[PDB]
Amino acid sequence: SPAELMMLTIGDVIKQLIEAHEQGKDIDLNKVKTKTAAKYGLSAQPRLVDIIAAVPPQYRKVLMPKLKAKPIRTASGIAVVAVMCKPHRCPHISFTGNICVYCPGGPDSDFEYSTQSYTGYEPTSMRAIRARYDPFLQTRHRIEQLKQLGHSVDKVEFIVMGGTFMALPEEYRDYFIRNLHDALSGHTSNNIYEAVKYSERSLTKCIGITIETRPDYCMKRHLSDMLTYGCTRLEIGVQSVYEDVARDTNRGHTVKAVCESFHLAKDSGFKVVAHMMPDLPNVGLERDIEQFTEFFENPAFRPDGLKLYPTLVIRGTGLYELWKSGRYKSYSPSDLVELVARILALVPPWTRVYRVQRDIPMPLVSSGVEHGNLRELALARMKDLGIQCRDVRTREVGIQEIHHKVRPYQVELVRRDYVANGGWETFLSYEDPDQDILIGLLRLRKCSEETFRFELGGGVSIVRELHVYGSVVPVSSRDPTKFQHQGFGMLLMEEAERIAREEHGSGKIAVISGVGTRNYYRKIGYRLQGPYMVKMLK
Amino acid sequence: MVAPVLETSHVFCCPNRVRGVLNWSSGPRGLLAFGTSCSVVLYDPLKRVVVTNLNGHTARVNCIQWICKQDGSPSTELVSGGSDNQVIHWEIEDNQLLKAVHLQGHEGPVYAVHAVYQRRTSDPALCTLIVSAAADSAVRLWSKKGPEVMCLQTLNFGNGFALALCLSFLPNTDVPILACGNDDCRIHIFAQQNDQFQKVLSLCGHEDWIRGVEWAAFGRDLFLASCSQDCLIRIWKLYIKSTSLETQDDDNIRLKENTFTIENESVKIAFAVTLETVLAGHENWVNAVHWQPVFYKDGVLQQPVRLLSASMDKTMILWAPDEESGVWLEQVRVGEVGGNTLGFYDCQFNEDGSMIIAHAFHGALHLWKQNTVNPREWTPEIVISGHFDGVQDLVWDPEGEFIITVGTDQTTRLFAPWKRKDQSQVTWHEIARPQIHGYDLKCLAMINRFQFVSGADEKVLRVFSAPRNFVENFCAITGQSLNHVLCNQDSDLPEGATVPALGLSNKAVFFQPSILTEPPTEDHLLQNTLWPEVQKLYGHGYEIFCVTCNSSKTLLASACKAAKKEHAAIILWNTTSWKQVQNLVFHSLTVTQMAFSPNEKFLLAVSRDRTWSLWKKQDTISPEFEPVFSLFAFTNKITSVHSRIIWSCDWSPDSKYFFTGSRDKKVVVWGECDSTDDCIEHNIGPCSSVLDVGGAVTAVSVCPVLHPSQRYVVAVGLECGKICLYTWKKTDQVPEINDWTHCVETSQSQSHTLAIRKLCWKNCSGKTEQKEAEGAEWLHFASCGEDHTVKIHRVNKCAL
Ligand SMILES: CC(=O)SCCNC(=O)CCNC(=O)[C@H](O)C(C)(C)COP(=O)(O)OP(=O)(O)OC[C@H]1O[C@@H](n2cnc3c(N)ncnc32)[C@H](O)[C@@H]1OP(=O)(O)O
Ligand SMILES: C[C@H]1O[C@@H](n2cnc3c(N)ncnc32)[C@H](O)[C@@H]1O
Ligand code: MET
């Protein structure tokens, strides 16, 4: 039978690998796989996961740096776990009578047992459906998969998806957040504060949480509530900078509300990521370029991250009815690629693009995008036109290392200042100028005159993000072929503490952080106050 | 006769989801103890029945630990800790409660408890030493001399925590010693010289959190077993150092000894600690570790050397040492590897080691027994089971041989009795779990003997029917006849059910044919015991809240959450061809409960808006058509007497009066609803006097038995889980005094701990007159609440 032949082939492969390790010579895996499969008479080849899932323990520890699969999953310095909430209705269904004109799925739809703005056939959607929307099971399952691939899960970040999370009853939000923290740490708590304490003392660090919210649910109350949870990032859907579009699609709010929410969130200390949608109705091929030029040149709009979602028409929505009646037509594919190239050429060097298109399966789409690799096609077109993309994602060491083959040689220090949302922003970085390679970054902001938090009033400057890229280095370990634990963090904080005292004129510095970061900043010399890590500068 | 005799018959519950909540006593005929919600339940595995509940806690129970004697007699004292900042010391006599003492002074929920008896020759009243650890980064010590307690000491760990504790005495002396496992991946040892505890030693080696330590005494040496989340188990060894002489064998390689010195009666004694071994074999976390207790065979004490461990990767391992070499070897590895189900929290031995028990992630209990002749074979056995979250509704078999419950744990369970030839007592066990749903369940109703309707946190009602193997299993276990239970009326029907590939539904498998003569275990219940779905009803705009059915088995009601008038509307269905019949628009808030009069000519509704309404059915012959309903009486703000939300209502057995209970701590009777022939408009109004029960009323029920003396007994439940039986009597005079009489009340161990959500008498309409009964000395009913518990109570007839 093929099964025992497969097993013997696998065992022989690990035997050769461990022998070669013992006498200490390098070995090529593909040739060994083919040769060993030839002997036992097979019609297939071994899979990497199978070879990983049969190593003895000590050898399992020693020889993972050769059998790892999908090296992109931890090429940015963290491990990402995505979880989903319970199905529910969007808050503006009541006082308007209906929801956005293009959103698919939801509690009242033909997509059975699916969350709003999702179909249920997606990877994460099918993971939570079989788990019946339980945060503990989802976290455990995803961490098990990540460990089975062969990655290190020392540092974790959560992403909470679904509809509007902050519109649910308080008890459910308590349940969800405390279960996430307990799943990481291993405790069995009763409320948020107990879970937060135990997670602070944990060994599997929780770097931060990300939540998606609407501009009318981002006020002082909601911001404070999210501050107690441990959240550090926000996702808001702007979709357009034009006031007529925001009311012809039954969005439910206005652009001025979006700007005010941006101002409050940035003064409180969060990070802002914006969803934008090209090819909206009543928006031609010339208003998109102006839209994005204003987006990146007007101080009221400048965000920290972007998500480009070209418009898709899906069955069971108002836009579907518009499309059937012969009143709405999509762009041609060449025009779409050209537009995306032009848009990507405008992104400033301090902005990071996380995703470039949706992930709806192709057969469910009636019109719109049909391919599945828009980003790389756009990059090739940009190379043809002679322009270049200079965002954050396509300039860091891991991406430059796996897509191209380059390494930093002549690292230098760079600083960029600007004005945004009524505040004076600075962006410090360590990067290689000649090859255009990014290593580590830090964001700093001087608090404006309209801050409401008690801890930040009276002359406080706040640090909003500190990050060093590369592959993941486990805590208290060192790897001379990677970039993390080599002192680029205490160099970036010493400079932030000099700007905040000699230029801002402040007398205190505050940091928003997770929990493992709490221990790190305690090591540096900061103390704890409220949900912040503060330090006197006098 | 002068006083009624209320007694409890059966209790169904499961342990909490905490580490160290289960503990098995030592000595012959010991008792198992675990914690459910706010109660400590004592369970007797040999008879497979629950003996009693100890309830004085106001929050979730976290730890339980028996106190071990020296003679080998069964223990009679134990200590518990709660998530209400307090510890409690209990005393037991004759399988009852004798006394309880509260120890207070913590500032967070407690999470670790231990206690021992003290040895001394002053003939004291059994002095006891207690140690506790909580979430306020502190460890506290207590002493209990008789009925008096006092706090000896407190220890502060900065911003750390203590996760495990154990107490014992140093060898060849009477100095207590303490071992504490911390989040620092480091064990701390304390010794009590003079009158206080002082740190002596710190042991390193682990590199993750520690989740259990245990002392053991072997000969003249002391052993310590430690487990962690490193997936590793370590054994240490403490002994008395030499006499500072006779040490001349320097031609050997030995580990460095960790030494300390203590003062005892003006004498210096030196002790040494050294590591013994490091076991391995687990993949996920190790949650608990335990030695084997000593026991007495024919007078002589036997002291085996064995170890037990339970892990998060669905496994248990038993370890024993090897005498040929210096290593330990696995002997038995028990569990079920595979499936999305997670692992175990706790594991326990028996008195002698014949049986082994384990506690699962959801709350299921697993029990294994060893064969007498084959010593490496273990088989599972029958254990208690129940919901792991709040129960919301309850129904009875129309003929009275099983009950069906739903809860916010997204499950539906069925309980039925077991009949065995070679015994007289009857015990009730779970045999069916006909739903594992994706929404929280709220309501249930019964249509036929093997068909029901369920309503959950969604806009859809569902209908479930029973497969074939269920009937065979039911008639086998309950002891009936297969031909007679079918009554030649069910005929051909599907065989089973299975989970669908996508979405939430049930699909007939016309699972596996598995005949059963004994109740199943918690691996056949999870998979092979579902029920097919045969209908699905739409027509509501929001999540369901209430369901009822008439006695003629052809109609059905419904309600949903609402904030306006166009959403709060009752809907009537059919039971032969499910379509909407008519919509009854009234009220502006949610309808909480409805009831059909036994005369099948009325329908009543109570709502959050402090009002109510009565709907009368008009009379037509029209055999092919269906009758209709319309308003017969109502109530506005002024006519309403309840000042707050109405929670329950019920009918009199003769369709004459009806009772309402609300949060206003009052139960009112509205009467003269009879004379349906021709009234001018109505005469409905208050027909009694209000009663101040003492707290919010959340359940009302009336016994379906008529007495010539015209007794109307009402079972009233409260938020605090009390059940009071009153006796209402119509005055028939213009004074309304002497209509409320208190008959009987539940005791402190027979009551619940949180709100009561349902009460239902046994309306055995199939047995209209009790043919085979002891003169019907007793009346049975059942209760459920938000304390994870379902209970069955029995009351004396002639007393009421
Ligand atoms: C605060 C926030 O918003 S999040 C910080 C970013 N989140 C991430 O962890 C992603 C990647 N982060 C990193 O690269 C690092 O964790 C940073 C940014 C915190 C520090 O970057 P580095 O340049 O690696 O720090 P640096 O080399 O100066 O310091 C190394 C020391 O920090 C320790 N350390 C690193 N991360 C942590 C942590 N989460 N908790 C505790 N100690 C930590 C290392 O163990 C090492 O200590 P040691 O070598 O003396 O034993
Ligand atoms: C989750 C995110 O998906 C985007 N989104 C919602 N509907 C559509 C659609 N039909 N096509 C493309 N993107 C869409 C919105 O930007 C929303 O914020
Ligand atoms: C999941 S959609 C994006 C978040 C939110 N519903 C918004 O429209 O802004």
Ligand code: SF4
């Ligand atoms: S708010 Fe977001 S999720 Fe809700 S309907 Fe609009 S686009 Fe969809």
